[PDB]
Amino acid sequence: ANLWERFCNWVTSTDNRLYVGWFGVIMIPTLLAATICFVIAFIAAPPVDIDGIREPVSGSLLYGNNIITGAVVPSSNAIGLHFYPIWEAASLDEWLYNGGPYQLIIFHFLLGASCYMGRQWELSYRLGMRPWICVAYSAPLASAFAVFLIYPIGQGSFSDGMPLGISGTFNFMIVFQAEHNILMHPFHQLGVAGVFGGALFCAMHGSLVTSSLIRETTETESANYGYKFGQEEETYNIVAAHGYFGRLIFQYASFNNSRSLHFFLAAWPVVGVWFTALGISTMAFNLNGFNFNHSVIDAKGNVINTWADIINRANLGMEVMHERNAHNFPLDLA
């Protein structure tokens, strides 16, 4: 009945339409700050000197951008990894030119999304659930940390953090490939397997359950009305699902235990995506994709090109053109 205790009970109430929780106490303000700044900058921020060379890139809609080309532009390379809050600028005009909004948005977002993951733990405890859904979300969350925080740290600049834009994203993945040969990096190859594989097993499992739905309806109505929310019996025939799938391949490559099947569904993309997040996080320290440039030579010592060499010619074209005005010296060491 005490004031603090009644507050505590409202924060942790399982009766709020949206759960707040103690993690929510930090998430809500920070996601609101990041969302509100993001929306306003995307529409109306003036151009930002991403690469510190007094060459501002225009990222917002009112400055001639569309949904596809617009972005919140990363802060100035002149700032590197220095903290640049609003109150460190002589004025908002300076803060805008140097890319201040990017920093505000990413720090609040990373914080708020971290608390999002904790909030998933918390409500699961309040509801008497097992606790590990948050572990599934750590795979996307790690990915966001890698491109917004870890890769700048290792490279020394939020200017090389991933842009908050559709085409900005593409600019980031093109430069990454030329500086790190990410395609030839095995952790990225595991991400692709995690993502291709994840979409495959999504399709498989959805098609396998859907194929074995038990007839509960007529042809004039959605089969979906054959399931009623909360019903105790299962709504498909898993043995029929197993009997089709086991024969499509062979018996023992098919799951007859739904718990093992669903845990496999969880782990495959989560682990692939951990690796591909690890990939970005370790290429942040410049431990790059396999390099087989000129690895095949003939008896005389002529180079016999492979597909790795052709890839290298593409990487080279990306390297020499990216940030065409920023380099004064012959090696792009960061």
């Binding site: 603090w4 205790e5 103690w22 609003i86 109150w87 509801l127 008497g128």
Partner: protein
């Protein structure tokens, strides 16, 4: 700017202490089954 900086320092400290004290207030006991 300094007014802004003080304000943000205050707002952040407030929320961080809600968090610290909220979890210090018998959080393990707020579950549906078994409370200590």
């Amino acid at each position: 700017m300094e007014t802004l900086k003080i304000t943000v320092y205050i707002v952040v400290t407030f929320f961080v202490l809600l968090f610290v004290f909220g979890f210090l207030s018998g959080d393990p006991a707020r579950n549906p089954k078994r409370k200590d």
